[PDB]
Design a binder for this molecule. Structure first.
Ligand SMILES: *[C@@H]1O[C@H](CO)[C@@H](O[C@@H]2O[C@H](CO)[C@@H](O[C@@H]3O[C@H](CO[C@H]4O[C@H](CO)[C@@H](O)[C@H](O)[C@@H]4O)[C@@H](O)[C@H](O)[C@@H]3O)[C@H](O)[C@H]2NC(C)=O)[C@H](O)[C@H]1NC(C)=O
Ligand SMILES: *[C@@H]1O[C@H](CO)[C@@H](O)[C@H](O)[C@H]1NC(C)=O
Ligand SMILES: *[C@@H]1O[C@H](CO)[C@@H](O)[C@H](O)[C@H]1NC(C)=O
Ligand SMILES: *[C@@H]1O[C@H](CO)[C@@H](O)[C@H](O)[C@H]1NC(C)=O
Ligand SMILES: *[C@H]1O[C@H](CO)[C@@H](O)[C@H](O)[C@@H]1O
Length: 307
């Protein structure tokens, strides 16, 4: 139609020290035919500073030499270019139309600018060993003058990355996405995943890091061999298990629980050990992703000396 209104991405992101182009289109009643279209861009911070003002060419000091209007206002194109970004410039940007006389219109729709300094690494909330896992590095690509070069850090045993390239997201903005597809093992637990966004012809370089929390079933690593004890002596049986999260350890005999605790290792203490304590003892390691069990035989085969 021919009505008052604007169109711009509600949210948009860009790296610190780079630039950002905020795509903008506005509309007005055709009946006016002003032949001269003026406009004003405001920043979020009762008395908002002026980013751009076509009539008086006035610019707030925080935007001087950093703000430039791309596209013709006469073509209903209010696209804004912001250069040499700094955290201070993070906030809401809204546009105001000026068609002379009483025809000034501050449009409702605005754009939130998020200035970042680290790439976005996306890891699924639950990484389990033995399952194919996708990990992505996302980076804003809304700067026409400076294109980010995406790269991974510390991804040796995770396979070679697959670059998706420039992808469109909602509200008509752009991102750079790189992928990692791999089946992690228990060894991949605690793996440092790093992503780097570098800009050629500049000294700008941004790095982000994340640690892989890889879940895996218990594997009993510490277990006593065949125990041959002296009569009346003290016997300590130790059972250690490696799992993520830490397992529930349980010492059992004759289908009866002797000791039980949520830990990496668990001791079973036997005092004044008699031949009646002979038999097979079992340690059970169990968590949310599996279980493991080991048995040990206890033999009181050494007679106690007189003392
Ligand atoms: C409102 O005004 C905006 C600004 O005036 C308009 O945005 C511009 O739209 C034009 C299309 O007419 C774009 O020009 C194109 O640019 C691409 C650049 O891609 C290549 O170049 C980069 C670096 O140079 C390179 O890294 C890439 O790999 C590509 O090879 C060219 O490929 C095209 O041939 C064409 O020249 C402007 O780039 C674009 N500017 C911005 C800031 O977005 C907008 O379209 C206007 N809106 C409407 C509705 O007309
Ligand atoms: C980046 O390249 C432009 C021209 O492509 C050049 O004018 C500018 O000096 C370069 N930046 C740096 C930091 O050298
Ligand atoms: C079982 O192994 C643990 C750790 O190696 C040790 O401390 C403990 O004494 C062993 N048990 C016996 C009965 O030797
Ligand atoms: C102990 O682990 C073995 C794996 O070989 C499994 O077959 C068995 O059912 C387990 N026993 C118990 C009581 O969970
Ligand atoms: C703009 O001005 C008002 C809206 O505030 C209406 O008369 C009409 O929508 C026009 O486009």
């Amino acid at each position: 139609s021919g009505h008052w209104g604007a169109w711009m991405p509600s949210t948009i992101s860009a790296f610190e020290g780079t630039c950002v182009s905020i795509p903008c289109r506005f509309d007005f009643p055709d009946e006016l035919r002003p032949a001269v279209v003026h406009g004003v861009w405001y920043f979020n911070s009762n008395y908002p500073p002026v980013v751009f003002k076509s009539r008086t060419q006035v610019v707030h000091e925080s935007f001087q030499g950093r703000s430039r209007l791309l596209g013709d206002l006469g073509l209903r194109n209010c696209t804004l270019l912001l250069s040499t970004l700094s955290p201070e410039l993070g906030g809401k940007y809204y546009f105001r139309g000026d068609l002379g006389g009483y025809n000034q219109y501050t449009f409702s729709e605005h754009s939130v600018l998020d200035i970042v300094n680290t790439p976005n690494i996306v890891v699924p909330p639950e990484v389990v060993a033995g399952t194919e896992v996708e990990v992505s590095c996302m980076v804003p690509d809304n700067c026409p003058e400076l294109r980010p070069e995406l790269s991974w850090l510390g991804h040796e045993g995770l396979g070679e990355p697959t670059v998706l390239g420039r992808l469109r997201e909602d509200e008509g903005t752009w991102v750079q996405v790189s992928l990692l597809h791999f089946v992690p093992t228990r060894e991949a637990n605690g793996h440092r995943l790093g992503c780097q966004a570098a800009f050629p012809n500049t000294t700008l370089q941004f790095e982000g890091y994340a640690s892989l929390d890889v879940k895996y079933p218990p594997v009993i690593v510490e277990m006593n061999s065949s125990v041959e004890a002296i009569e009346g002596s003290h016997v300590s049986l130790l059972c250690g298990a490696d799992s993520n999260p830490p397992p529930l350890l349980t010492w059992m005999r004759d289908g009866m629980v002797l000791r039980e605790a949520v830990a990496k290792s668990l001791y079973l203490d036997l005092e004044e050990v008699t031949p009646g304590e002979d038999g097979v003892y079992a340690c059970l390691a169990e968590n949310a992703y599996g279980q493991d069990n080991r048995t040990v035989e206890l033999s009181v085969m050494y007679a106690a000396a007189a003392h």
